Amino acid sequence: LEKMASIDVHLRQLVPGKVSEDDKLVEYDALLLDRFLDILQDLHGEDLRETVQELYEHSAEYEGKHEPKKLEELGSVLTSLDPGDSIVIAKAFSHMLNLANLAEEVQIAYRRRIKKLKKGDFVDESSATTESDLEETFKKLVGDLNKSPEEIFDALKNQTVDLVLTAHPTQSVRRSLLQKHGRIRDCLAQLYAKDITPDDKQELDEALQREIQAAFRTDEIKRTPPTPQDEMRAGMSYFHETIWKGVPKFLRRVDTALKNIGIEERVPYNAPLIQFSSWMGGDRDGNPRVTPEVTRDVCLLARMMAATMYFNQIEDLMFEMSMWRCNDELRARADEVHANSAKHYIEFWKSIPTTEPYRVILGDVRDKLYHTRERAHQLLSNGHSDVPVEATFINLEQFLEPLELCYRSLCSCGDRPIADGSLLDFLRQVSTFGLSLVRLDIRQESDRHTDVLDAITTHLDIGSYREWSEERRQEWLLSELSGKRPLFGSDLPKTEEIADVLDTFHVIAELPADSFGAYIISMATAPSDVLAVELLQRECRVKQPLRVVPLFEKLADLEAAPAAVARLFSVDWYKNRINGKQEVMIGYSDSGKDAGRLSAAWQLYKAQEELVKVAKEYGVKLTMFHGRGGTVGRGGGPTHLAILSQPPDTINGSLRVTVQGEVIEQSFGEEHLCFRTLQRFTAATLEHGMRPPISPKPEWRALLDEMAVVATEEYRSVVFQEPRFVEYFRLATPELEYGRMNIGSRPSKGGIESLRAIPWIFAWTQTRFHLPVWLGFGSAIRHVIEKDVRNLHMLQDMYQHWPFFRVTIDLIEMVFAKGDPGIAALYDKLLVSEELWPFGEKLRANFEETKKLILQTAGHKDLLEGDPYLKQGLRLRDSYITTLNVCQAYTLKRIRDPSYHVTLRPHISKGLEDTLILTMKGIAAGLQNTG
Amino acid sequence: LEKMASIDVHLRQLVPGKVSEDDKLVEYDALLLDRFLDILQDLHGEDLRETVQELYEHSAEYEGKHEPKKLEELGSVLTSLDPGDSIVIAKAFSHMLNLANLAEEVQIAYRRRIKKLKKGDFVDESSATTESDLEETFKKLVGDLNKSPEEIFDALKNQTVDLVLTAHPTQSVRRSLLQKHGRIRDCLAQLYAKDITPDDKQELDEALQREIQAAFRTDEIKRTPPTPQDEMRAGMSYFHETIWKGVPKFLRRVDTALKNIGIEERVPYNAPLIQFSSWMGGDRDGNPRVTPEVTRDVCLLARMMAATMYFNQIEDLMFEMSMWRCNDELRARADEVHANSAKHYIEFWKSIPTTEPYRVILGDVRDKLYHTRERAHQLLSNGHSDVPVEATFINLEQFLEPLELCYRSLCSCGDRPIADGSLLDFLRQVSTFGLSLVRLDIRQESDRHTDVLDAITTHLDIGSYREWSEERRQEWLLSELSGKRPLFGSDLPKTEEIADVLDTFHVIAELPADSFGAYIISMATAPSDVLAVELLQRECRVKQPLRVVPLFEKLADLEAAPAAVARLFSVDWYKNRINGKQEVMIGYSDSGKDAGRLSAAWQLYKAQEELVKVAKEYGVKLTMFHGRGGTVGRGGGPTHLAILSQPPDTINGSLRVTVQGEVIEQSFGEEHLCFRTLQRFTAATLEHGMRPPISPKPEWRALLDEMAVVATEEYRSVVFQEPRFVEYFRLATPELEYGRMNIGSRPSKGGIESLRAIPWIFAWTQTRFHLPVWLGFGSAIRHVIEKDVRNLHMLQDMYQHWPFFRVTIDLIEMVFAKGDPGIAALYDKLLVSEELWPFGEKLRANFEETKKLILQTAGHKDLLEGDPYLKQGLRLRDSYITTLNVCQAYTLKRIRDPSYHVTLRPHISKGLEDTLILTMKGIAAGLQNTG
Ligand SMILES: [Cl-]
Ligand SMILES: [Cl-]
């Protein structure tokens, strides 16, 4: 078995240099790949392993020199496989890619930082190896901006970072597989400890093999396209994995960094520096599977998960809190609680005596947590309970009061150090996570609210709210929100959809306010859209209404957005209802689908500028919600610069960002990764509030305004004006098969306009072409270079000195690293009509030209010249993804064309749809985020 | 704050050299003491801290040169303290000693072993730094003894180490403090990791301080001398601490060591290599607090703790067991289980589908475990349930059957590696721990069984079983055991004691046999005692009777023991009840109270010789149960040689040892210490079975017979013949205050004959005198040296070549290391009449002579010359213990003599019985095990 000598050689050719001297990435993936191929040989034979290894070697050679012969050599093997071998090979390359991902995460997590590699400017903040940690950000604010530590501390107290967990656009990886990946990363990391004994190392090797086999031997296709409740369960796994333990550890490090600049206080335990929100079970935009019952279910499930975690954590807390000296107030509470009926600690104590007063109070808290868990479970599984609401915690203050009593009491007696231990961690967990872990946002199209109001006005013989102008809509809505008479009853003709909308509001009214965040209006365009939701909320008897958040998607909607928000703030009722706070959402992917990516980027910078101007005019604290597709939605270090790049005063101590599902494992799967994620969000938010990016030079604004026009021209001329573009899109890409398959929901929700943004990005990401991300950049840069010889220099100045522009281009460059026009050409050759071949050829030429122009702008000769660690890891993954690409292409030809007969090969040792699904899930997991 | 500089110097003067180069003990204790004294100053003022540190400095100066002036310097300070300051000082020195122990444990756990320090003989097996680990034991058996790997493996399959956890003779440390000590050890160890970052180190220092203060600020008195259920709760904590996770790790290491000699199998997962037993709630010998209800309680509590641990452990198992390929048998069971009513994993899955068959079966197991816990809880708190017994696991086979089914199926599909992971660990935990974690032994005096049978026979108008000769007793008992008529009914005059005995039997009958171990007869002398218990068992309707175990205590009882066991094996009924297995218990401490320690040692070697001869005669497998006080009851390396020293064939793959409460923390408190404990018990049992110690030369046996005669003469002439000895014992020692206080139970079952062994040893251990351990050795060695010039050379030969003798002497040497005649003389000066002073002076001279003679025998100039690490650790503790000694002496004088007025000092910043209790608990924790 000298086969190992070959994969090592190929791996070393793929990743040649060393990005440091703790660079063990090739070692890691070589070990995992060797062990996997041995498992594969033992289960499916020697021939199967040899076939698979020949394929991988060819793929890696291709990612080296991109010789098209290597692609033809891959295809020759992949077409000759009967569906059984096709399934085994596809599964095999999926798991091989997963192992490359795990090795990459370990390498990232244990890479030593380099203080001497910092250049001293903001470019350092684009990579994890040079970004500023918490304390370096503190000292940068103290030295360069001459801010006093007390100002830094006061900024932190009132700062909030709000991370929003959304469903994965594909395989929301099951909780069990997350755990297996964790065990693999742990075995890997421990195997390279520079002190380990022979027997420990042998047992770790055997544990690693055992786990890799375990992951390879579980099916990941059948049953259902998981119900929204299941997807929510899988999405909540990261709280148990890292986030629950991670929040108090991070906050304590904030305390230590504050001590290292002279601050003696800690960050107050009730200060919400970190918050979590969820769309899982709340986003109904084009998703009929998300019903009123789904929302009720995930709300109660979240209350259960939280009560479970508090219940298990408070037993350790009860063992630690064995003091007897206490406050007079706490002693009074101990005597009161002792007069009652001790069922959840008989294994610990027969009963808690009054000479352990902290244990008395905490034991009663444990009892209330148990009743809350069992009660929410009874509500979920039936619809009623029998658990008195007074025996549980219904709001966060009931929970915090006795814990704070313990903290005050402990501090009274000089036991502050004891109080700053498990008790401080607990208080910070209650403040961060509340009774729900997450707050659920609800999202719905504006048109659905319009349908509801139209049925209402038609039922009252007043006209159709739909035909009314925006001004008449506003006038009627305003008369109703200010009036004293209810609007509608059961005697109302309701369609199925209208009943969905109203029932969602009724379920919101029947659940605790701690469970909900924002009501987000998709396709928001006018103030009447927001006022419709405020009115529907009020008339559905929602006592504590949700905050309404418009999502301005199309480009024209963004241009009209500050006008609409100003008109909203100018209405007296809405002004006094919002209580000085407004949240607006922007969708980078959504706007890019409308007008190309470069135009959407520059338009979103300008739109935030004007919205801040409005908020200052009316004295409102604005919160910008960054949807998916942004620079701030990337994985790792880049986010740090992206946050710093936002326009001045757009954050103001309140950051709300979508954590994309294709990135959540890279960000929260591992202990170190979790800490560093929380750290860069916190540090960048704090720094941006006190140190905005430079204001753009006037010529930069004018130049980008010009480029936006040319870029929208090219993008729309190809996507919307070319008649046969849609025909090509249906051939060169698995868009049709993606919706028809099983993943997500509905993609339409006519033409591309009705197509959702996620399938729009996905379809082209599968083919390694990425047209939605880069299209438009080429013609814009060509146009400005040709108009004036000097514009190139100006572009090169912007990329070097304007953070916004650098992050925009940097994201484009990263997407180009994951692109390969040769593979896209293979899709054309197999799946596209001949008379459409020049069309794709032209698009590929555009791909090439933009690439060179993007390089010229960034001052680079190769892609990602400034981030070799990412270039290295991407090359590693691409070697596995390429095989799944060729396999997916030929599998598509086999599905669509039963007249394409292939010379089959004999089956290799112990359904084309399953193959296709495997390749989609795999390629998606290897490319992760693009646009 | 340069106070740290003086204590560093004093520690370095106390422990001068370095016992290695990873010797960080002085550093460790300096760190712990600095942090503690800072906490003490912060809580109780600067004056209190200065007073305490002056005391410690004087104590270390004393342990340096033993100048008696230092003791008067301590006493002048300690008598002038009013009871409040007295309590604070005593508490402080107790916690300082605890911190010294924790540092010593960390040093032991992280001390690197030395391969080049092995000498190649059995002496290496007397210290943890040189003892043979598992694999070294294997190669010792394979190379030197010519045993085949198959033979070693077959021995391991059938080997059992049965460790019996007994109640602490003093403070059974509460579970909370065990956890706190764990955190202190963890912070200590992590602070010295040769890679730690500045912020991690800062936060670790703060966690260390936080924990030391937390432990110091909890009261450890009031309430009750904890109920036996509470003491049992505290005693079981080590399962959560280390043993539960620790057992499968060790067993897996046994598998690895087997692979390194060619064995390809694993130790069968159902093989009971490790077993745990408990006396907590079962020993009634002179302890009326242990009632039938107490035994029932700890039985149900144990079943609960076990069900909880299995329940929590099986969820991660359910996440790992996501395979789909399975057995025909398993697939059948999965389809069967799928037909039923999923309440304990909605947070995980809505329901378990049939395409995850292992999860189906395991989920049903998790459900049955939940019902087992809640049912045991309902019986404990009420007396009945309503949970059908068929919905739970009642015996170990019901539990193992589905788990083994999963293992077989996984192996069927080539998934054995997956099976040897969490599933193998789980199976090994079920086999080791059963449904109870521990099996409870029941212990009672034989005389109580005589009382029950006497009330029975008198009630039957047949005579008094008590007046009957032993032979008449045997004949009647045999006629009843072989007959069919029952013995008695409700119509039976029962005294409180007789009803206690019968009620205990009734509780045993109504509980699962898996909860119980052995029925132990204290003060056993004749076969009728065992037959009495067997008959009472049967007639109280115990369906599965316990195995009866006689405890032969007095020396004459030991001489008659092999005859009595032979007579038992010769009776057909008993021979058919025991099914080829018999367990006999011997009490090293118990026998020593009767006839001195040297005589009890030689008598126990001979008695084990003869018991083995009988067992081979009648074809019975003998198990020797070692009670408290033995060489095999020591801490650490000594146990390895102690086990290897037992007479040939006395173990035979079945070791049963009392884990004394004064050692259980040193043995199972930490992860590494736990593994090494389990390893040395396993390795020494295995080696002893295949490589018995040398048979003693005839002159060795003759010499020990003579020494035993002289030693028993001296011991009885001092302890039992001296008329004024009892008065001296009541004056020079805190024996009266110990029984009167609160600890344990009753110390007198009159004179010393009725005094129990535990208070006998404790009283003299408190004064650093240890007379019960060494008395008699002096005259025994003096006699033989004078009788023949060459006998010294013979003694030195035995110590060098006879393991039994070396371990016997080694224990004495270790006890002398914990002795200090100067402190004992201080007790004499304060508490003993003037005319009794020469008596104590003479005993102290005996102490000195015996010490010199033991040194001569061991070939040593100083004590513990061969184990410098232990000498160092004991010398470290002695500096703290000495202060509690002086404090205890003056406190005793103040309690007994209110005519002793002292010039008190003003109270120092922010009830003498409490102080006395503090000093007793402290000295007890610092001297740990002696005899
Ligand atoms: Cl559900
Ligand atoms: Cl109880």
Rg of chain B over all Cα atoms, to the nearest angstrom:
29
Do residues B443 and B282 lie in contact, with contact meaning Cβ atoms separated by under 8 Å?
yes
- Torsion angle of C-alpha atoms B405, B409, B412, B416, degrees rounded to 10: -90
Q: What is the DSSP string of A610-678?
A: HHHHHHHHHT-EEEEEE-TTSSTTSSSTHHHHHHHHSPTTSSTTEEEEEE-TTTHHHHHSSHHHHHHHH
- Torsion angle of C-alpha atoms A592, A598, A601, A602, degrees rounded to 10: -130
Query: Can you tell me whether residue A164 is helix, strand or coil?
Result: strand
Nearest CA in chain B to A319: B176
User: What are the CA-CA distances from residue B401 to residues B395, B406, B609, B628 (Å)?
Assistant: 11, 9, 41, 38
Amino acid found at A56: Y
Tell which residue, A28, A30, A40, A43, has the closest CA to residue A4. Answer: A30
Pairing of strands A621-626, B516-522: unpaired
Q: Output the six-digit token pair for A660.
A: 């994309």
User: What are the CA-CA distances from residue B353 to residues A223, A532, B339 (Å)?
Assistant: 8, 43, 12
Q: How was this structure determined?
A: X-ray
- Rounded Cα distance, B532 and B450, in Å: 8
Nearest CA in chain B to A374: B343
Residue B598, burial from CB neighbour count under 10 angstroms (0-12, 13-18, 19+): buried
φ and ψ at residue A857, rounded to 5 degrees? -65, -45
Chain B residues within 8 A of A229 when measuring between CB atoms: 350
Do residues A924 and A171 lie in contact, with contact meaning Cβ atoms separated by under 8 Å?
yes
Say which of B24, B554, B593, B606 is annotated catalytic.
B593
B186 reaches A (C-beta below 8 A): no
- Rounded Cα distance, A105 and A98, in Å: 11
Q: Which long-range contacts (CB under 8 A, 24 or more apart) does A540-544 make?
A: A540/A502, A540/A505, A540/A506, A540/A508, A540/A509, A541/A506, A541/A509, A542/A505, A542/A508, A542/A509, A543/A509, A543/A513, A544/A513
Q: Output the six-digit token pair for A258.
A: 């504050």
Q: Could B305 and A355 be called an inter-chain contact, meaning their C-beta atoms sit closer than 8 Å?
A: no
Nearest CA in chain B to A344: B377
Q: Output the six-digit token pair for B640.
A: 């390895």
Q: Could B343 and A418 be called an inter-chain contact, meaning their C-beta atoms sit closer than 8 Å?
A: no
Amino acid found at B791: N
Chain A residues within 8 A of B176 when measuring between CB atoms: 319-320, 322
Ligand nearest to the CA of A229: 1
Please give the distance, rounded to the nearest whole angstrom, from the Cα atom of residue A350 to the centre of ligand 2. Answer: 5
Give the contacts of B138 (CB within 8 A, at least 6 positions apart).
Answer: B149, B152, B257, B258, B260, B261
Q: Token pair 């905050």 is at which residue?
A: A547
- Torsion angle of C-alpha atoms A298, A300, A304, A307, degrees rounded to 10: 120
Please give the distance, rounded to the nearest whole angstrom, from the Cα atom of residue A436 to the centre of ligand 1. Answer: 16
Ligand nearest to the CA of B348: 1
Amino acid found at A843: L
Nearest CA in chain A to B209: A417
- Rounded Cα distance, B664 and B928, in Å: 10
- Rounded Cα distance, B76 and B892, in Å: 15
Count CB atoms within 10 A of the CB of residue B920: 24
Q: Nearest by CB to B323, from A217, A319, A325: name it.
A: A217
Give the contacts of A609 (CB within 8 A, at least 6 positions apart).
Answer: A647, A650
Do residues A882 and A819 lie in contact, with contact meaning Cβ atoms separated by under 8 Å?
no
Task: Mutation target for A interface from B347, B378, B382, B406: give the one with most A CBs within 10 A.
Answer: B347
CB–CB contacts below 8 A, A to B: 139
Q: Token pair 């999923």 is at which residue?
A: B342
Q: Could B207 and A421 be called an inter-chain contact, meaning their C-beta atoms sit closer than 8 Å?
A: yes
Q: What are the residues facing A274 on neighbouring strands?
A: A161
- Rounded Cα distance, A379 and A537, in Å: 24
* Residues of A (200-239) whose Cβ lies below 8 Å from B: 202-203, 206-207, 209-211, 213-214, 217-219, 222-223, 227, 229-230, 233
φ and ψ at residue A444, rounded to 5 degrees? -155, 150
Q: What is the DSSP string of B543-569?
A: SSPPEEEEEE-SHHHHHHHHHHHHHHH
Q: Token pair 């394929």 is at which residue?
A: A55
Tell which residue, B690, B688, B689, has the closest CA to residue B644. Answer: B688
Residues in chain B after which the chain is broken, C→N over 2.5 Å: 341, 749, 910
B2 reaches A (C-beta below 8 A): no
CB burial string B236-261: b at 16+ within 10 A, e below: bbbbbbbbbbbbbbbbbbbbbbbeeb
Q: Could A420 and B343 be called an inter-chain contact, meaning their C-beta atoms sit closer than 8 Å?
A: no
Tally of helices (H runs) and strands (E runs) in chain B: 41, 8
- Rounded Cα distance, A266 and A254, in Å: 8
- Rounded Cα distance, B844 and B855, in Å: 17
- Rounded Cα distance, A147 and A149, in Å: 7
Ligand nearest to the CA of A304: 1
Residue A377, burial from CB neighbour count under 10 angstroms (0-12, 13-18, 19+): buried
Amino acid found at A623: T
A593 is catalytic: yes
Rounded to a whole number of angstroms, the distance from the CA of A603 to the nearest CA of chain B is 43
| Deposited resolution, Å | 2.9
B346 reaches A (C-beta below 8 A): yes
Q: Could B304 and A223 be called an inter-chain contact, meaning their C-beta atoms sit closer than 8 Å?
A: no
Range list of β-strands (E), B376-488: 439-445
A168 is catalytic: yes
- Rounded Cα distance, B476 and A733, in Å: 96
SS percent in chain B: helix, strand, coil, step 5? 65, 5, 30
Q: Token pair 């590494």 is at which residue?
A: B672
- Rounded Cα distance, B331 and B409, in Å: 9
User: What are the CA-CA distances from residue A668 to residues A170, A382, A660 (Å)?
Assistant: 18, 34, 12
- Rounded Cα distance, B578 and B862, in Å: 50
Q: Output the six-digit token pair for B611.
A: 């018991």
Q: Could A233 and B349 be called an inter-chain contact, meaning their C-beta atoms sit closer than 8 Å?
A: yes
